[PDB]
Amino acid sequence: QRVTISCSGSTSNIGGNTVNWFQHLPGTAPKLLIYSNNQRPSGVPDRFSASKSGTSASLAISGLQSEDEAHYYCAAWDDS
Amino acid sequence: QRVTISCSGSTSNIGGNTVNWFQHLPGTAPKLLIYSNNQRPSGVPDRFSASKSGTSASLAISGLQSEDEAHYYCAAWDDS
Amino acid sequence: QRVTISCSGSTSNIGGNTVNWFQHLPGTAPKLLIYSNNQRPSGVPDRFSASKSGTSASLAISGLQSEDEAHYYCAAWDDS
Amino acid sequence: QRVTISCSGSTSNIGGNTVNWFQHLPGTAPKLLIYSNNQRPSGVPDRFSASKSGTSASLAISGLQSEDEAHYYCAAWDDS
Amino acid sequence: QRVTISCSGSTSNIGGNTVNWFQHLPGTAPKLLIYSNNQRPSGVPDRFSASKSGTSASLAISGLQSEDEAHYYCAAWDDS
Amino acid sequence: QRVTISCSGSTSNIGGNTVNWFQHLPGTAPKLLIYSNNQRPSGVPDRFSASKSGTSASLAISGLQSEDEAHYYCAAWDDS
């Protein structure tokens, strides 16, 4: 036999960039405030898996590739 | 036999970029405030899985690829 | 036989860069404050796995590739 | 007799000011050029006077009180 | 007799100021050039006077009180 | 008799100031050049006077009280 199995992954290519951010900002006054008292997630897989709990109270400004990846690739189970 | 299995993944390519963000901002006054007291998610898979709990109280500004990916690819179960 | 198995991974290439960040900012006054009292996640896989708990109360500014990757690739189980 | 002679002068009062000029100018490219080959004035008073010759090839931006004053006040001649 | 003669002068009062000039100028490129070959004034008073010759090839930016004053006040001539 | 003669002068009062000039200037490139070959003024008063010759090839930026004053106050001539 000639069984062929080929999974894949997270191949990334950005290129160029020069994002320069935020420049030339005369006088501002950022006075943010964050205060949380909840958001308790959970997850209870039994047979299969790759649950992904996630909590945040951030400001969430993303420039390039701010992912929170979590991979689980090409699993198997026979129990012969 | 010649069984052929080929999964895929998260292949990304951005290219160029030069996003420059936010520039030339005369005097502002950001005074944001965040205060949460709830949003508790959950999830209880039993046989299959890859539940994905997610909570946020952010501001959520995205420039490029602000994903929150979670993969579970090509699972199997025989129990022979 | 000629069985061929080929998984993949996280191949990345950024290129160029020169992100320059944030420059030329006349007098500002950042006075942020963070105070949390909750967000306790969990996860209980039994047979399969690669759960990924994650908690944050940050500000979450990302310039390039701020991921939180977690991989689990090409697992197997026979129990012969 | 009670002859009373009262001339006047250049009394000035500006007040306040805070002219701030020209601010917050992202990248420009001033490439001015001046080249003159003439403008020769003259003046030949004989009996009375206070002629005022003036020549310029400037750019002439004025913010406040850019005068070129020249005074000659309360003259007399008797030749008794 | 009670002859009363009262001339005046150049009384000035600015007040306040805080002119701040020109601030927050990202990258420019001033490449001015001045080259003159003329502008020869003159003046020939005979009996009276206070002629005022003046020549310039400047750029002439004035912020406050850039005068070029020249005074000649309360002259007399009797030749008794 | 009670003859009263009262001339005046150049009384000045600025007040406050804090002119701050020109600040926060990212990379520039001043390459000015001045080259003159003329502007020869003159003046020939005979009986009265206070002529004022003046020549310049400057750039002429003035912040506060850049005058070029020249006074001649309360002259007399009797020749008794």
CA angle C46, A43, A48 (to 5 degrees): 40
B42 with C44: CB under 8 angstroms?
A: no
Q: How far apart are CA A73 and CA B7, in angstroms?
A: 9
Backbone angles phi, psi at D21, to 5 degrees: 50, -140
Interface test with D, best of A20, A22, A23, A24 (most D CBs within 10 A): A24
Q: Give D24-45 as a DSSP string.
A: ---S------EEE---------
The 10 Å CB-count burial string (b at 16+, else e) for D15-31 is eebebebebbeeeeeee
**Residue from D51, B15, E16 nearest A16 by CA:** B15
In terms of Cβ atoms closer than 10 Å to its own Cβ (0-12, 13-18, 19+), residue A13 is middle
The verdict on a CB contact (< 8 Å) between D26 and A24 is yes
Q: What is each CA distance from D46 to C73, D54, E54, E78, in whole angstroms? A: 106, 19, 20, 18
F77 with E47: CB under 8 angstroms?
A: no
Q: How far apart are CA A11 and CA A71, in angstroms?
A: 13
The beta strands (E) that lie in D37-79 are given as: 55-56, 61-62
SS3 state at E34? strand
Q: Which amino acid is at A32?
A: L
Q: Which residue has the tokens 């690829």?
A: B65
> Do B and F touch, counting CB pairs below 8 Å (3 needed)?
no
Q: How far apart are CA D71 and CA D41, in angstroms?
A: 20
How far is C74 from chain A, CA to nearest CA, in Å? Answer: 5
The verdict on a CB contact (< 8 Å) between A26 and E26 is no
Residues in chain A: 80
Q: How far apart are CA A65 and CA C13, in angstroms?
A: 12
The resolution of the experimental structure, rounded to one decimal in Å, is 2.9
With a CB cutoff of 8 Å and minimum separation 6, the contacts of E11 are: D9, D10, D11, D12, F8, F10, F11, F12
Q: Which amino acid is at D49?
A: S
Give the A:C interface size as CB pairs under 8 Å. 310
Tokens of D79: 């030749």
What spatial distance separates the first Cα and last Cα of chain E, rounded to whole Å?
A: 21
